[PDB]
Amino acid sequence: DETTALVCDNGSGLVKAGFAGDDAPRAVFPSIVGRPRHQKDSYVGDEAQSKRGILTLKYPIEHGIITNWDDMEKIWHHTFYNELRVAPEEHPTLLTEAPLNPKANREKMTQIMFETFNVPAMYVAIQAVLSLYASGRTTGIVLDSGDGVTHNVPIYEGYALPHAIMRLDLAGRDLTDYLMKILTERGYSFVTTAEREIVRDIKEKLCYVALDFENEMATAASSSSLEKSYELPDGQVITIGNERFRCPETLFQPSFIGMESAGIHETTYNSIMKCDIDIRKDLYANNVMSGGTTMYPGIADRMQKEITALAPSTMKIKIIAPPERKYSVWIGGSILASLSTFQQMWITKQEYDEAGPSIVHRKC
Amino acid sequence: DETTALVCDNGSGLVKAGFAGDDAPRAVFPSIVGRPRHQKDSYVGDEAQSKRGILTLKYPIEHGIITNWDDMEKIWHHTFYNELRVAPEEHPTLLTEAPLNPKANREKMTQIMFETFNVPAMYVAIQAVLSLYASGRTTGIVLDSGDGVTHNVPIYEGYALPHAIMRLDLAGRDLTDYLMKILTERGYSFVTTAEREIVRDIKEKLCYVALDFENEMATAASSSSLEKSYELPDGQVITIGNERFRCPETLFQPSFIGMESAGIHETTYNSIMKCDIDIRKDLYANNVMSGGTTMYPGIADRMQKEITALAPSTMKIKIIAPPERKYSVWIGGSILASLSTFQQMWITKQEYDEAGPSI
Amino acid sequence: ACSGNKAALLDQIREGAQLKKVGRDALLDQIRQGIQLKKV
Numbered sequence: 001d002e003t004t005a006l007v008c009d010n011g012s013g014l015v016k017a018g019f020a021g022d023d024a025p026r027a028v029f030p031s032i033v034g035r036p037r038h039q040k041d042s043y044v045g046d047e048a049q050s051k052r053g054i055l056t057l058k059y060p061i062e063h064g065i066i067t068n069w070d071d072m073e074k075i076w077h078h079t080f081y082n083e084l085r086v087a088p089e090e091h092p093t094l095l096t097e098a099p100l101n102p103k104a105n106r107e108k109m110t111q112i113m114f115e116t117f118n119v120p121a122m123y124v125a126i127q128a129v130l131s132l133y134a135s136g137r138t139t140g141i142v143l144d145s146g147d148g149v150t151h152n153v154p155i156y157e158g159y160a161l162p163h164a165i166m167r168l169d170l171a172g173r174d175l176t177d178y179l180m181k182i183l184t185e186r187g188y189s190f191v192t193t194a195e196r197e198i199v200r201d202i203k204e205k206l207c208y209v210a211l212d213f214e215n216e217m218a219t220a221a222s223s224s225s226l227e228k229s230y231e232l233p234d235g236q237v238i239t240i241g242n243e244r245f246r247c248p249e250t251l252f253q254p255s256f257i258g259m260e261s262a263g264i265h266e267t268t269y270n271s272i273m274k275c276d277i278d279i280r281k282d283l284y285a286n287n288v289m290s291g292g293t294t295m296y297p298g299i300a301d302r303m304q305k306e307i308t309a310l311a312p313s314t315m316k317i318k319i320i321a322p323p324e325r326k327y328s329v330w331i332g333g334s335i336l337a338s339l340s341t342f343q344q345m346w347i348t349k350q351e352y353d354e355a356g357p358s359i360v361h362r363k364c
Numbered sequence: 365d366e367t368t369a370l371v372c373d374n375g376s377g378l379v380k381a382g383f384a385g386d387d388a389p390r391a392v393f394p395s396i397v398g399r400p401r402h403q404k405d406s407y408v409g410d411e412a413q414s415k416r417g418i419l420t421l422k423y424p425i426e427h428g429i430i431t432n433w434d435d436m437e438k439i440w441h442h443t444f445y446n447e448l449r450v451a452p453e454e455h456p457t458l459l460t461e462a463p464l465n466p467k468a469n470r471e472k473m474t475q476i477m478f479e480t481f482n483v484p485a486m487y488v489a490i491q492a493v494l495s496l497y498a499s500g501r502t503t504g505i506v507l508d509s510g511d512g513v514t515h516n517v518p519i520y521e522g523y524a525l526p527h528a529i530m531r532l533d534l535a536g537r538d539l540t541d542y543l544m545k546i547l548t549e550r551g552y553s554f555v556t557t558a559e560r561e562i563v564r565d566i567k568e569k570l571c572y573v574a575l576d577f578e579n580e581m582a583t584a585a586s587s588s589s590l591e592k593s594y595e596l597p598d599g600q601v602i603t604i605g606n607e608r609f610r611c612p613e614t615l616f617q618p619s620f621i622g623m624e625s626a627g628i629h630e631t632t633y634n635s636i637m638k639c640d641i642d643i644r645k646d647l648y649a650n651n652v653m654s655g656g657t658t659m660y661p662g663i664a665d666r667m668q669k670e671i672t673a674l675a676p677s678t679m680k681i682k683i684i685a686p687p688e689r690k691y692s693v694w695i696g697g698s699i700l701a702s703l704s705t706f707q708q709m710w711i712t713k714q715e716y717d718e719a720g721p722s723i
Numbered sequence: 724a725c726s727g728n729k730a731a732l733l734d735q736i737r738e739g740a741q742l743k744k745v746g747r748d749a750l751l752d753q754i755r756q757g758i759q760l761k762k763v
């Protein structure tokens with residue numbers, strides 16, 4: 001793969017990167033950069049936490065938005081030179097951004113890609129949209145939930161609807177936190193050295209969503225139907241019960257981590273209600289879920305149930321949970337970038353040299 | 365053994381040298397060089413002290429640091445040509461250095477090895493680390509105590525932690541001195557001609573560490589439980605009692621030779637305290653001891669006791685005293701140099717010719 | 724795009740399409756492993 005396009009999706013927690021045309025990211029590494037805590041000069045990814053002990057670790061991406069441009073540069077460098085092993089100047093590069101990304105950010109990003117990395121061509125696409133594309137639709141409402149943030153994004157004919165976007169500062173990073181908390185409140189000594197890592201694995205291995213939380217609690221109270229076990233490496237085995245479904249419940253009841261916000265079913269319903277009454281039909285029947293925090297077993301049907309209850313009785317609801325939705329966004333991009341009707345949509349270095357960083361903002 | 369790697373650990377008092385892959389140094393000789401006191405041109409090792417009488421003896425290594433580069437050259441020459449009987453230019457050579465070795469020294473050493481000895485490849489490794497390796501660990505705190513100096517070295521994942529290193533200019537060379545002193549203060553005429561030698565043998569044969577110094581003194585005061593005897597060659601037999609454990613006690617109480625420094629238990633504890641709070645657990649449970657001055661019977665348990673008292677009650681402590689710790693460092697190197705994941709870590713003459721000593 | 728080009732891109736997307744099917748740490752690990760040493 002040379003003279004081919006690159007796809008780079010920068011999550012709050014995870015970076016996904018690869019080549020357009022590929023069915024999956026060749027590179028998935030933690031979105032973190034570490035510099036020597038005292039006085040080589042920088043580390044990124046797995047190696048940065050491997051040596052967390054002698055570095056100050058930082059996260060360029062907070063809430064899905066880029067906040068540290070220097071550190072973000074180191075991430076992109078590590079992406080091209082160290083992960084993909086490619087030269088940016090001979091690959092058009094597609095990049096992804098959060099809904100509601102400020103214009104100054106988009107331009108700052110376009111500006112770096114050109115001046116600093118000297119890529120021949122580039123494009124910025126909104127993450128949620130790519131997810132939708134990945135499913136083969138151009139109309140619907142996406143629920144993207146990654147490590148740092150959660151959005152509801154209504155989309156109509158390839159264009160998102162900014163007035164109707166719902167943002168929720170609750171994602172997997174805080175769900176892992178919640179689980180770590182509870183687990184400990186039951187005598188399980190957990191810290192960050194290496195525990196934080198285990199707590200996350202338990203999360204993705206054992207947690208699931210209850211179709212009926214009140215009802216599911218009573219089950220785990222009257223039998224051991226729902227107990228499951230996890231042997232730590234130390235050796236100490238531990239058992240989990242209602243904790244398996246109480247942790248993800250936080251997505252529907254944020255008041256579990258004490259957030260007086262509303263749950264993803266409500267924000268999904270509110271988001272649709274915020275749209276043209278004539279396209280609601282299309283939206284209700286096209287809930288596409290993306291992100292790693294949507295991977296919980298049972299979340300699709302819980303959502304289906306919750307929404308059927310909020311909406312009109314006559315409307316047909318539908319939830320689409322691609323088994324690959326952990327990587328939907330990236331896949332969405334992988335597809336786009338490879339299509340031929342898209343090849344005219346690239347921003348060329350030439351175009352940028354004439355107009356300026358502002359040559360990356362279109363309406364319609 | 366040809367085209368194989370060489371391992372060379374230069375102590376303040378002793379040089380250890382051999383071949384990588386071997387379980388022990390084929391050559392262990394005094395780290396001293398003697399030149400004609402008045403006017404062949406140089407002697408090294410056992411032969412140099414054999415003829416001390418007509419030479420000026422000198423020690424290139426003081427405090428574990430190389431201070432005389434000319435003399436150090438003669439040592440390395442004697443190592444290759446006269447001990448190992450090898451040619452440097454056909455053997456990668458691994459060398460050892462003290463914690464906190466100045467960069468100019470390391471480079472000066474790399475520079476000699478290449479320009480003067482023309483070895484194909486070389487590596488410099490920190491002595492304490494090798495000891496740790498020898499024990500099969502890559503994380504822990506080493507207590508290296510040889511003839512000239514004592515260090516506490518905290519190490520995490522193969523890398524030492526320089527901010528946390530504790531140096532103590534008290535080792536076996538001064539313990540032998542202390543013992544020589546006392547012994548004499550009891551009517552035993554001891555000088556250097558050949559006595560100094562005996563005093564050292566008595567040290568390594570009879571000295572040990574008390575688990576409870578105050579308590580051990582009272583024992584040797586109320587009975588002869590702890591007396592032991594040593595026949596000199598002259599013939600004159602001599603008896604030792606509390607001197608057997610008072611001599612090593614100097615490691616825990618430097619105020620015995622009038623050093624207002626703190627003991628190895630304290631510096632060990634201080635060294636750990638100087639580290640990241642998250643790796644202290646690993647360190648406390650991995651005290652590896654190396655050097656010939658750690659060979660005293662009872663030192664492992666004294667240390668275990670002393671540290672349990674300084675540290676949190678909840679922390680698990682552990683002392684590892686390899687029976688081979690006299691040679692840990694060298695062994696540590698012997699192992700390293702032979703490993704295959706290491707063969708890319710060598711500094712090649714080529715690499716040196718391009719960049720410079722700073723490579 | 725804001726032109727008649729956007730409709731074909733859109734249509735193309737819905738259509739579908741496949742996607743091609745896809746030193747210090749080792750030294751460290753080796754050390755811990757252990758080793759035998761020729762006897763002298």
Ligand SMILES: Nc1ncnc2c1ncn2[C@@H]1O[C@H](COP(=O)(O)OP(=O)(O)OP(=O)(O)O)[C@@H](O)[C@H]1O
Nearest residue numbers: 011012013014146147148149172204291292293295
């Ligand atoms: N099987 C699983 N079950 C539950 N959670 C999972 C699973 N797999 C991954 N996750 C969670 O998904 C999160 C990462 O997902 P993703 O890569 O979509 O987010 P991101 O793009 O890095 O961040 P964001 O999109 O919030 O900016 C992690 O917090 C991880 O715990």
Ligand SMILES: Nc1ncnc2c1ncn2[C@@H]1O[C@H](COP(=O)(O)OP(=O)(O)OP(=O)(O)O)[C@@H](O)[C@H]1O
Nearest residue numbers: 375376377378510511512513536568655656657659
């Ligand atoms: N069995 C023993 N009991 C006590 N001391 C011993 C014993 N064997 C050796 N020693 C002492 O160990 C010292 C030499 O140890 P070692 O070879 O580790 O030091 P070195 O590397 O030459 O010097 P340094 O490490 O201080 O620069 C000598 O002073 C010797 O008296």
Ligand SMILES: [Ca+2]
Nearest residue numbers: 010011012146
């Ligand atoms: Ca994301």
Ligand SMILES: [Ca+2]
Nearest residue numbers: 374375376510
């Ligand atoms: Ca030494």
